[PDB]
Amino acid sequence: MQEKQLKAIQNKIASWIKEIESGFIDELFSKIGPSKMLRSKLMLALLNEKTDAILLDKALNLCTIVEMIQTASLLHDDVIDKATMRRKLPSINALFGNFNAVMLGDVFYSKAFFELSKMGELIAQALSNAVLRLSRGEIEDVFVGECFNSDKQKYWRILEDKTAHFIEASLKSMAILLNKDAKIYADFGLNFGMAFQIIDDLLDITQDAKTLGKPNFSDFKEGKTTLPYLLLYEKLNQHDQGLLISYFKQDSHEIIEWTKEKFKQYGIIEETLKTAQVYSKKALEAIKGENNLILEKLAQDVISR
Amino acid sequence: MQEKQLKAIQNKIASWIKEIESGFIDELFSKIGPSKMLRSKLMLALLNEKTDAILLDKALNLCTIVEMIQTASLLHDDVIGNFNAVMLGDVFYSKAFFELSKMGELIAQALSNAVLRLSRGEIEDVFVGECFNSDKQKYWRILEDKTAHFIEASLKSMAILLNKDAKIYADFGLNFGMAFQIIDDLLDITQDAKTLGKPNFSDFKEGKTTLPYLLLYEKLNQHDQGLLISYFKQDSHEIIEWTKEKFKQYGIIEETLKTAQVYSKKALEAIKGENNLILEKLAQDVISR
Numbered sequence: 001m002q003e004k005q006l007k008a009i010q011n012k013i014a015s016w017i018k019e020i021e022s023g024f025i026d027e028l029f030s031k032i033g034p035s036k037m038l039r040s041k042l043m044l045a046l047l048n049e050k051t052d053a054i055l056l057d058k059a060l061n062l063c064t065i066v067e068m069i070q071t072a073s074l075l076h077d078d079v080i081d082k083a084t085m086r087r088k089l090p091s092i093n094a095l096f097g098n099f100n101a102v103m104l105g106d107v108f109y110s111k112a113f114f115e116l117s118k119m120g121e122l123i124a125q126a127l128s129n130a131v132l133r134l135s136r137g138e139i140e141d142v143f144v145g146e147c148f149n150s151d152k153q154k155y156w157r158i159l160e161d162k163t164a165h166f167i168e169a170s171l172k173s174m175a176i177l178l179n180k181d182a183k184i185y186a187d188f189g190l191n192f193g194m195a196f197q198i199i200d201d202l203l204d205i206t207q208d209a210k211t212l213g214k215p216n217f218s219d220f221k222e223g224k225t226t227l228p229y230l231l232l233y234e235k236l237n238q239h240d241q242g243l244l245i246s247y248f249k250q251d252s253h254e255i256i257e258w259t260k261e262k263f264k265q266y267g268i269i270e271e272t273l274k275t276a277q278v279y280s281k282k283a284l285e286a287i288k289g290e291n292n293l294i295l296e297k298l299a300q301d302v303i304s305r
Numbered sequence: 306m307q308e309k310q311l312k313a314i315q316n317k318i319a320s321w322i323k324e325i326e327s328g329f330i331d332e333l334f335s336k337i338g339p340s341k342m343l344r345s346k347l348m349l350a351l352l353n354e355k356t357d358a359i360l361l362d363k364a365l366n367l368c369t370i371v372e373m374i375q376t377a378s379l380l381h382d383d384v385i386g387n388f389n390a391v392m393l394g395d396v397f398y399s400k401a402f403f404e405l406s407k408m409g410e411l412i413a414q415a416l417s418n419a420v421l422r423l424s425r426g427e428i429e430d431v432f433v434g435e436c437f438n439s440d441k442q443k444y445w446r447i448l449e450d451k452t453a454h455f456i457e458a459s460l461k462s463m464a465i466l467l468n469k470d471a472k473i474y475a476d477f478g479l480n481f482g483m484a485f486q487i488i489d490d491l492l493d494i495t496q497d498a499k500t501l502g503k504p505n506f507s508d509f510k511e512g513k514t515t516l517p518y519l520l521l522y523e524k525l526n527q528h529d530q531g532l533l534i535s536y537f538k539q540d541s542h543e544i545i546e547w548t549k550e551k552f553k554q555y556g557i558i559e560e561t562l563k564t565a566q567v568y569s570k571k572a573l574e575a576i577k578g579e580n581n582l583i584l585e586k587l588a589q590d591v592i593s594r
């Protein structure tokens with residue numbers, strides 16, 4: 001979204017890490033790679049042409065807090081998922097051990113909350129509550145992930161806790177800071193977040209025409225029964241249901257090929273996509289009144305891969 | 306300490322956990338054992354005889370926040386519990402911070418900075434622990450970040466809440482915290498005063514060159530210094546018994562204790578103006594183990 005502002009947020013994060021004054025932490029931080037900063041792009045979109053410089057800095061600080069929280073959650077998630085990689089490069093836990101990845105995440109969380117306390121109680125509570133739900137969602141995700149899950153309601157709760165509510169809280173917080181209608185943007189954030197994670201789960205099992213890279217097929221192998229698998233399970237005959245369950249947490253090329261044929265057989269890809277489009281439509285609906293081209297741009301683009 | 310108050314805090318932690326509304330979390334929480342709640346005792350000691358009910362409740366909420374931060378750090382520290390520990394730790398930290406959100410900027414910043422510092426401390430401990438350490442200043446920096454500063458911030462925070470001299474109590478907490486951790490390191494290699502039950506000897510084995518080891522290293526001859534360094538991060542009875550004999554040979558136990566007494570005295574001296582019987586008792590007891 002706006003390069004110069006994202007660049008300023010990137011630099012604020014670096015400054016905040018240096019403020020911790022620890023050569024060891026500087027070392028750990030140097031191994032974390034760039035971020036798309038999707039959340040900052042969404043939040044920055046609420047800024048006005050005439051936002052005063054003092055308020056703009058506060059807004060950049062808010063975006064910095066949100067990105068650091070996001071980074072902290074990813075650091076802990078990589079530990080819990082025993083991930084050795086994050087975007088083709090070695091994870092922090094792979095390079096410095098689980099303990100360091102965990103502490104580094106705590107450092108990101110605490111430094112972020114420290115700065116957050118200067119935002120006021122309304123914003124501080126919205127974001128700190130979002131971090132509480134992110135942690136509840138993470139626990140829910142691995143407990144539900146212990147065995148094949150066919151209860152779609154548990155899936156929806158996890159998506160909302162681990163992804164949707166945080167984006168909702170981030171947008172609501174920026175609206176509050178900029179004295180905008182917090183309800184409208186919280187609503188846009190929640191639905192955008194739901195669509196975003198559904199498409200993300202979709203991209204794990206189906207090709208992104210735009211890239212030649214093949215889908216990772218990382219989810220089911222890791223115990224996550226995402227929407228595609230839930231919708232497929234509801235259409236499979238008894239025999240195939242047995243097979244799908246037997247493939248839970250298994251890892252092989254043949255299982256991937258079988259799964260792709262089954263999704264095609266029951267039109268799961270389009271069915272999954274349509275579920276996300278409902279949320280995408282709701283997001284656009286929420287900001288119908290406003291005239292935010294950036295948000296409308298992002299809300300439409302998430303649905304097209 | 307005040308057992309009725311500690312009980313109320315214990316119950317607040319339980320109700321705060323239930324407010325998260327997660328059966329999975331309730332299950333993980335039921336596995337958490339009791340706590341001595343040393344930090345609540347120090348903080349509760351600042352309350353006046355006739356503190357009003359509204360303020361009292363705020364004070365209890367503050368102790369609850371501090372005890373949950375303490376539990377969260379212990380959980381993450383045990384990762385050095387599977388990933389259940391990392392998860393439950395985040396739950397404790399986040400709930401505590403959410404409630405801290407309602408406490409006013411000064412207290413919110415004091416405690417969040419404390420968590421930042423103790424996390425920095427943990428990291429310093431791991432990195433410094435990659436090889437034998439003879440630099441005592443690195444040890445003190447670690448003790449301050451990982452243990453002393455949080456106790457300092459907890460007392461400072463309660464002082465602010467109760468409108469007392471924050472400076473006096475922060476000073477008490479910092480010094481008490483240094484003594485506390487020194488004694489803790491001593492208890493890892495010496496027998497405790499009335500219990501059966503031998504010392505764990507977990508520190509040096511884990512790569513931590515604690516005060517006893519630093520003071521010993523300073524007295525050993527070249528031959529024994531070489532042995533000690535070679536025993537770094539090793540686990541054997543031979544090493545344990547050799548170390549015990551060396552501590553005795555150079556009066557290290559007593560030298561370590563005197564060091565802790567210095568901070569204990571500085572702590573007492575900070576609240577001398579005060580006449581706080583509970584705090585004085587604690588600073589004293591910390592040293593008698």
Ligand SMILES: [Mg+2]
Pocket residue numbers: 200201204
């Ligand atoms: Mg994914």
Ligand SMILES: [Mg+2]
Pocket residue numbers: 489490493
């Ligand atoms: Mg110890």
